[PDB]
Design an enzyme around this catalytic site. Sequence first.
Site: not given
Lengths: 214, 214, 213, 213
Positions: B44-46, B86
Amino acid sequence: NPKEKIAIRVAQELKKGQLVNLGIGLPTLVANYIPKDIHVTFQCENGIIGMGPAPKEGYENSDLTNAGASYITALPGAMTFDSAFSFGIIRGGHLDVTVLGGLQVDEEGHLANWMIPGKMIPGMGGAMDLVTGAKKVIVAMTHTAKGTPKIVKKCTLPLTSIRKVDLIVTELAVIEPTDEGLLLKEISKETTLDEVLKLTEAKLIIADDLKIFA
Amino acid sequence: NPKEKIAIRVAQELKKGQLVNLGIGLPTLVANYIPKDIHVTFQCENGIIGMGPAPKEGYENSDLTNAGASYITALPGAMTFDSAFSFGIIRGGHLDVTVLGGLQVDEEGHLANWMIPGKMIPGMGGAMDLVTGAKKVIVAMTHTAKGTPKIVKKCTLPLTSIRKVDLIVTELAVIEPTDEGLLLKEISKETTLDEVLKLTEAKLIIADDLKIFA
Amino acid sequence: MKVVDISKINELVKEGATLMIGGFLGVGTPENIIDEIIRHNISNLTVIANDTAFEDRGIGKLVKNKLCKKVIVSHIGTNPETQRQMIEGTLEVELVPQGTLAERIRAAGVGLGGILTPTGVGTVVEKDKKVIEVEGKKYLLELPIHADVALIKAKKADYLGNLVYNLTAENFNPIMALAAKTVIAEVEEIVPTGTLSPNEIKTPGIIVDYIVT
Amino acid sequence: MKVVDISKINELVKEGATLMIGGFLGVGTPENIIDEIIRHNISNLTVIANDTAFEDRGIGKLVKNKLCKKVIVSHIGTNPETQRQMIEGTLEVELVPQGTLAERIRAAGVGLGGILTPTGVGTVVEKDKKVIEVEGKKYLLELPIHADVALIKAKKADYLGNLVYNLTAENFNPIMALAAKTVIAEVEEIVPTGTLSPNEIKTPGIIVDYIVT
């Protein structure tokens, strides 16, 4: 003792709370003369904030060295990190002071300290990043190379950076590069102003309140 | 049901050992249908590698969410990290698959999926980086928007990227963009070839081994 | 002493300030600092952040109270009030692809003059960017983003101000810590020096100017 | 599986390979991998690293056995054999400022097309670089550095290949892990998954292809 003279005076330049980087060789002696009331933190480019003195025999850690690969301690609260983060601190304006050795400094404040063509070719390492990025650059260096002046009108050796260094400390003089040129601020108790000028090729401006110290 | 059709077929495209990123909306359903022998890891990009399913009630952690801020679990061996790291994974070619929703895809395999002028203006978030950097981009979308074809000759909505996506999966068709244009590889068991082509404005190349599936 | 009372935010954040604020949709955001800004009507702000969260939380509270003159973010879709002020023209919104935002903030923090990214080439993001070709591939030159103050959130600080983060609350916080002139960290717990090992600290105390709980 | 016998280096490191090798003056360097390269006399290498360590250790062993055609490094001063081969012309040496080297390797790892740095401006480093001015200041455009294989050293890997490092042995290792096509990690210990926390891992196992030692 010229190296001790320089190291003592450089240590007196450091201010409480500063993050300081010491080059290998002469600058490393500075850590031995920090005024007791002055707390600084040391950074090494190979990836530590919080470098301490050499460990007692038997307390060495193979993974914990300075930028010369000599064993060091880490003080409580130290942080270790990768080389990108390390040069983010250095290049990014987060290092208050770097103390580096010198081969020449000229009247532009330009430092040459990484190569002598045909003689010493060690590479620049982190020196170009350190001179470019440190909030304050102090050059700690003997005044001459076996009598040959190292404070010169214009560097003839390869430059480390075009940034103007902030202080030169030798065993004879303390000099501040300024927009007008090199400002002589202090001379050693064991020398004279005449001797300093005889051994400096660069033009020097003389401060009104010239001091004695180192 | 069409969303289930799509999610099942996309899930069948994933390979053992891959790192996969699922966009919000239809792609998140893919995680519901991973064949039982296929083991993938989700990013997940977060800032997580190793996203798991939503926690059982009472097991939520306020600091552990997906990129919609919904609570997730982290599986054993997960790593969390900052947004630069990320997008190093995402932009740097370390993400094997991203599955993203679509507004339009065109004959160049260009995806528009972040903005409809005068209507939906959410910003692009990480979508441009994901389409640009994922090793494989799968677009999981319904074939039409209330009857309007979404697979078009040239996108009229703002592009997410000029990268050619690798696969389009709708409830009617599986299409692979190629150098020659869009290759129709499969159609749904519940449709006909003519129905697929009628609801596609783009020209399709019909595979000689056209398959039934999704 | 780095630790100050939270009520000192009004002394440290000026009207019109350019602020980086940590948090991903309000996760890892300095909620108590945000509440101080709201309480003291510190307005005309430029906020650099991933997003404007939701109307009820985090950076969204600043937009709800009309304290932002401008936001520089990657995403606004979860906050309809941000969208309404953008459309009405009272809030300037500068959209930045999220990975680009991370690298542009980082560049300011680590002393780079810019970075080249393939993200956004051939999209509307290319508008008003220098395009540089390297080995036959096009990149956008993206420039460092500076700020007056970083308002970051962390899990713990030791007595020296060293910070650790927790899970997906990390996001932009350690990047912003490097990039702004002044750094204020909201932390959940102050722990003794030696609780956070040299191998796990992510932000060194030397770059943290103030700490609030 | 990822863990392989050290003889597998001969399958993965080709004659003529371009290699990123971790370690700062031999601290945090994959000594066992280097020893296998020496055992099989794998030569014509291009080695990207901070330095050539010392004649007796680490990357310096590769130079001593004349296995490098080229080194791309920031420092060679502690290895007189490197300097001798440089002067004789049998070893090509590309000197790179250490901070620039980090960012150039990182650019390859994170998908950037280059970075702008003020370091080296107006020095010999400026030779054959594009100069870009931004806001009245000059920067060198420095380009990503790629490699076939990253040979990295880590303190521990878990069963999934997640890595942690130890103190100043970290240096270039996690940067090179992101930047090479294939990643081989030499590790001191394999630990169970769940021994390394999500908050402390520095290199995720997904990018580590092979593990030895």
